[PDB]
Amino acid sequence: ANKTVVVTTILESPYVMMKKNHEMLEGNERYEGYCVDLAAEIAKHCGFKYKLTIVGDGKYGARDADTKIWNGMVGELVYGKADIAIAPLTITLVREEVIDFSKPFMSLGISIMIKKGTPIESAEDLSKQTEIAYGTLDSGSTKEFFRRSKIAVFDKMWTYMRSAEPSVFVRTTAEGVARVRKSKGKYAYLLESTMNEYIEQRKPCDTMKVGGNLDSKGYGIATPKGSSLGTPVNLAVLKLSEQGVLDKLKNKWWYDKGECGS
Ligand SMILES: CC(C)S(=O)(=O)NC[C@H](C)c1ccc(-c2ccc([C@@H](C)CNS(=O)(=O)C(C)C)cc2)cc1
Ligand SMILES: C=C(C)[C@H]1CN[C@H](C(=O)O)[C@H]1CC(=O)O
């Protein structure tokens, strides 16, 4: 018999956010955003009931080198705590080895956020100077990209970042953004282009994304390996793409009510 599907996700604007009047509400109704709408669409097209839950440890999914335990949403999937993850979860080799990803539902790449006026146009620009500090989230796919890169510029950047004092790493998107905004052009933040483009359209309208992306990848919906949900979820993602629903949802949550003009 069908059993209610436990969705693991995480608060990250505009993917999942607490409604302002969330306290008056209950269950799935508490939340709003791109991934909330997407979960509704997937569930509709797969014929399942579901429960949105916020990941306990606030993490996306990494493996501890010593203990080999997976944390975050990937962890919830691997250890049987959740049946599906619907979040801006980057498709990576290390994650795909232990869970299944759908086809991607959104494209992104690592990108550069600056406070307007910062004299930086590219990663190379960043790598060749020291006056403007720059960094990434303290863990996640961006940091791993830098840690593992053999590309000259990116190698030089990682070498700088891992040793910079005080730390150039941040714990949350909100923190990286606040640091850009409050550092008077002396901090640039390396983050996924999706969040970058989102932030650029929000007041106080004092940041921007500069240069091309450093890589090209996607977010995927994740299921435990061998789940019966894998195939229908994947097909649902293809369908939503082809029906224009993914485009409509990204417009809805990024641009339709952009706050920095046209
Ligand atoms: C991690 C990498 C292997 S990757 O991200 O999967 N691909 C790398 C390559 C550069 C790339 C990167 C991103 C995309 C890409 C293209 C489209 C989309 C959305 C809009 C729809 N995805 S879909 O699979 O094409 C669709 C028909 C459902 C999402 C991601 C396609 C290819
Ligand atoms: C917001 C976080 C911590 C997530 C979102 N996608 C990446 C991931 O799935 O690891 C992380 C961002 C990043 O690494 O820039």
Coordinates of C-alpha atoms and ligand atoms in Angstrom, one line a residue:
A1 CA 0.0 0.0 0.0
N2 CA 1.1 3.5 -0.8
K3 CA 2.8 5.2 2.1
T4 CA 3.1 9.0 2.6
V5 CA 6.4 10.2 1.0
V6 CA 8.8 12.0 3.3
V7 CA 10.4 14.9 1.4
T8 CA 13.6 16.3 2.9
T9 CA 14.4 19.9 2.0
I10 CA 16.1 23.0 3.4
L11 CA 15.3 26.6 3.9
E12 CA 17.1 28.5 1.1
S13 CA 15.5 31.5 -0.7
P14 CA 13.7 31.4 -3.0
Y15 CA 13.6 27.6 -3.1
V16 CA 12.0 27.0 0.3
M17 CA 10.9 29.8 2.6
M18 CA 8.7 30.1 5.7
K19 CA 5.5 31.9 4.9
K20 CA 5.2 35.1 6.9
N21 CA 2.1 33.8 8.7
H22 CA 3.6 30.3 9.0
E23 CA 2.6 30.0 12.6
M24 CA -1.1 30.2 11.7
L25 CA -0.4 27.2 9.4
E26 CA 0.4 23.6 9.5
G27 CA 2.4 21.0 7.6
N28 CA 3.3 21.6 4.0
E29 CA 1.3 24.9 4.1
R30 CA 4.0 26.4 6.3
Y31 CA 6.4 26.8 3.4
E32 CA 6.6 28.5 0.0
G33 CA 9.0 28.8 -2.9
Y34 CA 10.3 27.2 -6.1
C35 CA 11.0 23.8 -4.6
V36 CA 7.6 23.7 -2.7
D37 CA 5.8 24.3 -6.0
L38 CA 8.1 21.7 -7.7
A39 CA 7.3 19.1 -5.0
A40 CA 3.6 19.7 -5.6
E41 CA 4.0 19.2 -9.3
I42 CA 6.2 16.1 -9.0
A43 CA 3.8 14.6 -6.4
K44 CA 0.9 15.4 -8.7
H45 CA 2.5 13.7 -11.7
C46 CA 3.7 10.7 -9.7
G47 CA 0.4 10.2 -7.8
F48 CA 1.8 10.4 -4.2
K49 CA 0.9 12.2 -1.0
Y50 CA 3.8 13.8 0.8
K51 CA 5.2 15.6 3.8
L52 CA 7.7 18.4 3.6
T53 CA 10.4 18.1 6.3
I54 CA 13.4 20.4 6.9
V55 CA 16.7 18.6 7.2
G56 CA 17.8 18.4 10.8
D57 CA 21.4 19.3 10.5
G58 CA 21.0 22.1 8.0
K59 CA 23.3 20.4 5.4
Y60 CA 23.0 19.3 1.8
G61 CA 25.1 16.2 1.7
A62 CA 28.8 15.5 2.3
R63 CA 30.7 12.4 3.6
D64 CA 32.9 12.7 6.6
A65 CA 36.4 11.5 5.6
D66 CA 37.0 9.7 8.9
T67 CA 33.7 8.2 9.8
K68 CA 32.4 7.9 6.4
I69 CA 28.9 9.0 7.5
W70 CA 26.8 11.2 5.1
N71 CA 25.3 14.3 6.5
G72 CA 22.5 16.5 5.3
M73 CA 19.7 15.7 2.8
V74 CA 21.9 13.0 1.1
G75 CA 22.4 11.5 4.6
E76 CA 18.6 11.5 5.2
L77 CA 18.2 9.6 1.9
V78 CA 21.1 7.1 2.5
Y79 CA 20.0 6.2 6.0
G80 CA 16.3 5.9 5.3
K81 CA 15.1 9.0 7.1
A82 CA 13.6 10.5 4.0
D83 CA 12.3 9.1 0.7
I84 CA 13.2 12.0 -1.6
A85 CA 15.2 15.3 -1.5
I86 CA 13.7 18.3 -3.4
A87 CA 16.1 21.3 -3.0
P88 CA 18.9 23.1 -4.8
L89 CA 21.0 20.0 -4.5
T90 CA 23.9 20.0 -6.9
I91 CA 24.4 16.9 -9.0
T92 CA 27.9 15.7 -8.2
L93 CA 29.9 12.5 -8.8
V94 CA 30.4 11.7 -5.1
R95 CA 26.6 12.1 -4.4
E96 CA 25.5 10.1 -7.5
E97 CA 27.6 7.2 -6.3
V98 CA 25.3 6.9 -3.2
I99 CA 21.9 8.2 -4.3
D100 CA 20.0 8.6 -7.6
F101 CA 19.6 12.0 -9.2
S102 CA 16.8 12.8 -11.6
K103 CA 17.6 14.7 -14.8
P104 CA 18.4 18.2 -13.7
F105 CA 15.5 20.6 -13.1
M106 CA 17.6 23.8 -13.2
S107 CA 21.0 24.7 -14.7
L108 CA 23.6 26.6 -12.8
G109 CA 27.3 27.3 -12.6
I110 CA 29.7 28.7 -10.0
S111 CA 29.7 32.5 -10.3
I112 CA 31.0 35.7 -8.8
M113 CA 29.0 38.1 -6.7
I114 CA 30.4 41.6 -6.1
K115 CA 29.1 44.7 -4.4
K116 CA 28.4 47.2 -7.2
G117 CA 31.6 49.1 -8.2
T118 CA 34.1 46.4 -7.2
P119 CA 36.9 46.4 -9.9
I120 CA 36.6 42.7 -10.7
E121 CA 35.4 41.1 -14.0
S122 CA 36.4 37.5 -13.7
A123 CA 37.9 34.6 -11.7
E124 CA 41.4 35.5 -13.2
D125 CA 41.0 39.0 -12.0
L126 CA 40.3 37.7 -8.5
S127 CA 43.3 35.4 -8.7
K128 CA 45.7 38.0 -9.4
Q129 CA 45.2 40.3 -6.6
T130 CA 44.8 40.3 -2.8
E131 CA 43.1 43.6 -1.9
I132 CA 39.7 42.1 -2.6
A133 CA 39.3 39.0 -0.5
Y134 CA 37.0 36.3 -1.8
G135 CA 35.6 33.0 -0.7
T136 CA 33.0 30.2 -0.8
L137 CA 30.6 28.4 1.6
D138 CA 32.5 26.4 4.1
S139 CA 31.4 23.1 2.5
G140 CA 29.3 22.1 -0.5
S141 CA 29.9 21.6 -4.1
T142 CA 31.5 25.0 -4.7
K143 CA 34.2 24.5 -2.1
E144 CA 34.9 21.0 -3.4
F145 CA 35.1 22.4 -7.0
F146 CA 37.9 24.7 -5.8
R147 CA 39.6 22.1 -3.5
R148 CA 39.9 19.6 -6.4
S149 CA 40.5 21.9 -9.4
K150 CA 43.7 21.4 -11.5
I151 CA 42.9 24.5 -13.6
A152 CA 45.6 27.1 -13.0
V153 CA 43.5 30.0 -12.0
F154 CA 41.2 27.9 -9.8
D155 CA 44.2 26.2 -8.2
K156 CA 45.7 29.6 -7.3
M157 CA 42.3 30.7 -5.9
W158 CA 41.9 27.7 -3.7
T159 CA 45.5 28.0 -2.5
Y160 CA 44.8 31.6 -1.5
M161 CA 41.4 30.8 0.1
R162 CA 42.5 27.8 2.3
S163 CA 45.2 29.9 3.9
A164 CA 43.6 33.4 4.1
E165 CA 43.3 34.9 7.6
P166 CA 40.8 35.7 8.8
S167 CA 38.6 33.1 7.1
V168 CA 37.0 33.9 3.7
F169 CA 34.6 31.0 4.1
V170 CA 31.0 31.6 5.1
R171 CA 28.3 29.3 6.6
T172 CA 25.2 30.3 4.7
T173 CA 24.2 32.2 1.6
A174 CA 22.8 35.0 3.8
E175 CA 26.2 35.3 5.4
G176 CA 28.1 35.5 2.1
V177 CA 25.7 38.1 0.8
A178 CA 25.9 40.1 4.1
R179 CA 29.7 40.0 3.8
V180 CA 29.6 41.3 0.3
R181 CA 27.2 44.0 1.2
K182 CA 29.1 45.2 4.3
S183 CA 32.7 44.9 3.1
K184 CA 32.7 48.0 0.9
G185 CA 33.9 46.1 -2.2
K186 CA 36.6 44.2 -0.3
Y187 CA 34.8 40.9 -0.4
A188 CA 33.7 38.9 -3.4
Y189 CA 31.5 35.8 -2.9
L190 CA 31.7 32.6 -5.0
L191 CA 28.3 31.1 -5.2
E192 CA 25.9 29.3 -7.6
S193 CA 24.6 31.5 -10.4
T194 CA 21.0 30.7 -9.5
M195 CA 21.3 32.3 -6.0
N196 CA 23.5 35.1 -7.5
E197 CA 20.8 36.0 -10.1
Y198 CA 18.2 35.8 -7.4
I199 CA 20.0 38.1 -5.1
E200 CA 20.7 40.6 -7.9
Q201 CA 17.0 41.2 -8.2
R202 CA 16.4 42.0 -4.4
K203 CA 16.7 45.2 -2.5
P204 CA 18.9 46.8 -1.6
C205 CA 20.0 46.1 -5.2
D206 CA 23.7 46.6 -4.4
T207 CA 25.2 43.4 -5.7
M208 CA 25.8 41.9 -9.2
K209 CA 27.0 38.8 -10.9
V210 CA 30.1 39.3 -12.9
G211 CA 31.9 37.4 -15.6
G212 CA 30.9 34.0 -17.1
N213 CA 30.3 31.0 -14.9
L214 CA 33.2 28.9 -13.8
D215 CA 31.4 25.6 -14.6
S216 CA 28.1 24.2 -15.8
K217 CA 25.9 21.8 -13.9
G218 CA 22.4 21.3 -12.6
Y219 CA 20.3 20.7 -9.5
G220 CA 18.6 17.2 -9.4
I221 CA 15.9 15.6 -7.3
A222 CA 17.5 12.8 -5.2
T223 CA 16.1 9.4 -4.2
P224 CA 17.7 6.5 -2.3
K225 CA 19.4 4.0 -4.7
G226 CA 16.8 1.5 -5.9
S227 CA 13.8 3.6 -4.9
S228 CA 10.5 2.9 -6.7
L229 CA 10.2 6.7 -6.9
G230 CA 13.3 7.2 -9.0
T231 CA 11.8 6.4 -12.4
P232 CA 8.5 8.2 -12.1
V233 CA 10.2 11.3 -10.6
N234 CA 12.7 11.4 -13.5
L235 CA 9.9 11.2 -16.0
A236 CA 7.9 13.9 -14.2
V237 CA 11.0 16.2 -14.4
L238 CA 11.2 15.6 -18.1
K239 CA 7.5 16.3 -18.5
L240 CA 7.6 19.5 -16.4
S241 CA 10.6 20.7 -18.5
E242 CA 8.8 20.0 -21.8
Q243 CA 5.6 21.6 -20.6
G244 CA 7.3 24.9 -19.8
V245 CA 6.5 24.5 -16.1
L246 CA 10.1 24.7 -14.9
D247 CA 10.6 28.0 -16.9
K248 CA 7.3 29.3 -15.4
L249 CA 8.4 28.5 -11.9
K250 CA 11.8 30.0 -12.2
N251 CA 10.3 33.2 -13.6
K252 CA 7.7 33.1 -10.8
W253 CA 10.3 33.0 -8.0
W254 CA 13.2 34.9 -9.5
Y255 CA 12.0 37.6 -11.9
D256 CA 8.3 38.2 -11.9
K257 CA 8.5 40.3 -8.8
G258 CA 12.2 41.4 -9.1
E259 CA 12.7 44.4 -6.9
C260 CA 15.5 46.2 -8.7
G261 CA 13.6 47.4 -11.7
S262 CA 13.6 46.4 -15.3
Ligands
LIG1 C1 26.7 17.2 -13.4 C2 26.7 17.2 -14.9 C3 27.0 15.7 -15.4 S1 25.3 17.8 -15.6 O1 24.9 18.9 -14.8 O2 24.3 16.8 -15.5 N1 25.6 18.2 -17.1 C4 26.8 19.0 -17.5 C5 26.5 19.9 -18.8 C6 27.5 21.0 -18.9 C7 25.1 20.4 -18.6 C8 24.8 21.3 -17.5 C9 23.5 21.7 -17.3 C10 22.5 21.2 -18.2 C11 21.1 21.6 -18.0 C12 20.2 21.8 -19.1 C13 18.8 22.0 -18.8 C14 18.3 21.9 -17.5 C15 16.9 22.0 -17.2 C16 16.4 23.4 -17.8 C17 16.2 20.8 -17.9 N2 17.0 19.6 -17.7 S2 17.0 18.4 -18.8 O3 17.6 17.2 -18.3 O4 17.7 18.8 -20.0 C18 15.4 18.1 -19.3 C19 15.4 17.3 -20.6 C20 14.8 17.2 -18.2 C21 19.2 21.6 -16.5 C22 20.6 21.4 -16.7 C23 22.8 20.3 -19.2 C24 24.1 19.9 -19.4
LIG2 C1 23.4 26.4 -0.3 C2 24.3 25.3 -0.3 C3 25.1 25.1 0.9 C4 24.3 24.3 -1.4 C5 23.4 24.6 -2.6 N1 24.0 23.8 -3.7 C6 25.4 23.4 -3.3 C7 25.4 21.9 -2.9 O1 24.4 21.2 -3.3 O2 26.4 21.5 -2.3 C8 25.7 24.2 -2.1 C9 26.1 25.7 -2.5 C10 27.5 25.9 -2.9 O3 28.3 24.9 -2.7 O4 27.8 27.0 -3.4

